[PDB]
Design an enzyme around this catalytic site. Structure first.
Site, short mmCIF file in Angstrom:
data_model
loop_
_atom_site.label_atom_id
_atom_site.label_comp_id
_atom_site.label_asym_id
_atom_site.label_seq_id
_atom_site.Cartn_x
_atom_site.Cartn_y
_atom_site.Cartn_z
N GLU A 17 0.80 -1.22 0.00
CA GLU A 17 0.00 0.00 0.00
C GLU A 17 0.84 1.28 0.00
OE1 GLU A 17 -3.13 0.09 -0.57
OE2 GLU A 17 -3.93 -1.87 -0.10
N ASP A 75 -6.22 6.72 -5.06
CA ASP A 75 -5.71 5.36 -5.14
C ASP A 75 -5.78 4.93 -6.60
OD1 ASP A 75 -8.32 4.62 -5.72
OD2 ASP A 75 -8.58 3.35 -3.98
CL LIG Z 1 -2.36 2.77 -1.59
#
Ligand SMILES: [Cl-]
Ligand SMILES: *SCC1=CC(C)(C)N(O)C1(C)C
Ligand SMILES: [Cl-]
Ligand SMILES: [Cl-]
Length: 164
Positions: free
Chosen positions: A11, A20
């Protein structure tokens, strides 16, 4: 290696609001704020999540607190879900982390939809599960991450994460 280090690799960490891979407002270690197109709606969710007027920026301690809450929620979501829990219970510790990773990324509802792959995992047909998991939007949209997670399911080791 463990679930936290694993998701930190997948992440990343950003201390200011960002979009994102799907274009949704996110912060910290993959903490989704909102699917709404509005940056104001995201800042409001962020303030609510953190408990102070942030103006879109958080500290590392704050990012890690959201991360702890998110990993905990993902685990508890698996254990309360009737399709996920039996798969989770059947798996060894490394493959359990792979399942948590998927739930963290796509949510409990999304993963419960991989009906055929879950059945193959429960049966411990690792090569066949890996091939089925790759026939997915998930794999096509985020291939490098999906490959790491799928390799983890296939081998039961941390090899896909070790040179990272
Ligand atoms: Cl992310
Ligand atoms: S998903 C199984 C599979 C089919 C084929 C196209 C022959 N492959 O290279 C793999 C092993 C991915
Ligand atoms: Cl929250
Ligand atoms: Cl990717």
């Amino acid at each position: 290696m463990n679930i936290f280090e694993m998701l930190r690799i997948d992440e990343g960490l950003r201390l200011k609001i960002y979009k994102d891979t799907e274009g949704y407002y996110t912060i910290g270690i993959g903490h989704l704020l909102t699917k709404s197109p509005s940056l104001n709606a995201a800042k409001s969710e962020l303030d609510k999540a953190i408990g102070r007027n942030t103006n879109g920026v958080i500290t590392k301690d704050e990012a890690e607190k959201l991360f702890n809450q998110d990993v905990d929620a993902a685990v508890r979501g698996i254990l309360r879900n009737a399709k996920l829990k039996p798969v989770y219970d059947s798996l060894d510790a490394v493959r359990r982390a792979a399942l948590i990773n998927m739930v963290f990324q796509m949510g409990e509802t999304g993963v419960a939809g991989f009906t055929n792959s879950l059945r193959m995992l429960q049966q411990k047909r690792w090569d066949e599960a890996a091939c089925n998991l790759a026939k997915s939007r998930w794999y096509n949209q985020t291939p490098n991450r999906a490959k790491r997670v799928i390799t983890t399911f296939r081998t039961g080791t941390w090899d896909a994460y070790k040179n990272l």
